[PDB]
Write a protein that binds this ligand. Sequence first.
Ligand SMILES: COCCn1cc(Br)cn1
Ligand SMILES: COCCn1cc(Br)cn1
Lengths: 293, 262
Amino acid sequence: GPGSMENFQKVEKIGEGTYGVVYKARNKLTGEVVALKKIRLDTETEGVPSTAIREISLLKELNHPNIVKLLDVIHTENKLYLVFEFLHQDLKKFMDASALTGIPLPLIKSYLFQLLQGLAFCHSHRVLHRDLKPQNLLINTEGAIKLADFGLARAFGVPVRTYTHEVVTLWYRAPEILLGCKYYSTAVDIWSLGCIFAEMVTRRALFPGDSEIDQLFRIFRTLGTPDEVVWPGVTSMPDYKPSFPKWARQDFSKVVPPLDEDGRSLLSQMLHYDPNKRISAKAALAHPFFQDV
Amino acid sequence: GVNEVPDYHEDIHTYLREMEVKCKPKVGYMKKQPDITNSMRAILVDWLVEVGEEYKLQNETLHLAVNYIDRFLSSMSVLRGKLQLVGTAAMLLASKFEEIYPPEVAEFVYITDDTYTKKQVLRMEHLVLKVLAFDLAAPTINQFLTQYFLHQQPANCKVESLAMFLGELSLIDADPYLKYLPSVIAAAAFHLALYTVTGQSWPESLVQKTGYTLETLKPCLLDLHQTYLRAPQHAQQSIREKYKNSKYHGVSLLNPPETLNV
Ligand SMILES: COCCn1cc(Br)cn1
Ligand SMILES: COCCn1cc(Br)cn1
């Protein structure tokens, strides 16, 4: 769009990754602080990466206060610069460093309510995030929290076709993916948010598995092993095995003890086994838990 | 259920209806192209149909590529010698967007029969991305079709595949199909398929959803119906060959209706 690196002054490195390096930077004409994510194309024998093509194309369309904004894309034969709205921190760092005796209930509710707005906005625009985890949720000084990192996102059709498997960072990954289901939908993003809701309360991951099978077993031991009653089709799923241990569902008040009745209600609806019964972002915005937000 | 996103399908439909208007090519674009013609475009699209089947690409990929091509040729004048280069870069971009496992760039070079270089393919990819301003999440005929399909009482795979086929046929012929939005062609294609297979007509529930009626679809339908009748005589045949395959229920072998009564 209308940008040139000559108008930016780099300030510090703020993060890295396969994508590449991200810098905090300052617009010298307007004063705006931005994050610059550099994607090297000169190092690319396969042209512009598919992650970048998705991130840019999908973010161009998603203008929402709870989705980080793509302000610009600077084109070079050698390089590609994504200019983002800057946010000081991510939820993981806020949890590790400042939330030592906890995140207060008002702030949990506020963040979860904003995450659902952002996610509902994604789903209404036929976009799955597919990597919702605290590291990918950015907070500012004004109390906003915003979905970021759409490198693993995908534009879906209705109904959905088979997409890439084993998506989502394992701790946040929905049982339908772990069971090799042919089709997955908006319900996978809700599962992730459910895991995150719990994590904001306890400051610890809900299901920290070391393998797909360990992940499943941790879930099963928490919510009980699913059967044809709780989840029709489960026993027909490609990576469902009849040998799976059959764990009793523990009372939900034990899963996240400090959580209140409304909290527990909402969390249970986010972590419903059957993707068809799992609550939508849109529906969850009306849940009583948010009454006083 | 959730695979059909009950809570989002209207939102999504409405949004695609908006976006198909933004992503629309210039209807008159070929007259302003000094060196290329509808006939050359038809050859290209037909070729891209073959490339998709050789590499077992999704039909969505095919529709996206054509969208990229038509938009690009709406603002950029191209010599006949380079039309294939544009098409190749479009297929690459579409594959990287839509495929789980896109073909590697080298395979894209290979299919062009060493007409172009790896370097040429990648620089055009860059150009197409510049011209389209990375605006790649375009609504296709397929995205509409699959939603319309949820209104069959009950589901009929011959209907679905035939509709897909007719939609694909429209990609080949800029005249007249550039003048219709994906959602309207999909409507025409759905009704024609449904009529041909079951005798039934465009459902009222789809009148509720779309606001389209047989009245409003009539122009497109008369063109699609003629395209269907003449399809065995078209110079381009790759879509018909493709739709003989059992994967698509051999629908290209069904007989078009002689009249619509519409
Ligand atoms: C944790 O701070 C990361 C800074 N940042 C990255 C983007 Br994209 C926007 N802001
Ligand atoms: C020089 O070639 C004529 C233009 N053309 C190429 C394809 Br593929 C289709 N049309």
